[PDB]
Amino acid sequence: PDDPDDPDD
Ligand code: NA
Ligand code: NA
Numbered sequence: 765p766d767d768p769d770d771p772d773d
């Protein structure tokens with residue numbers, strides 16, 4: 765969730 769390019773984060 766913290767990383768707008770990474771659906772898992
Ligand atoms: Na994300
Ligand atoms: Na950030």
Ligand code: NA
Nearest residue numbers: 767768769770
């Ligand atoms: Na990233």
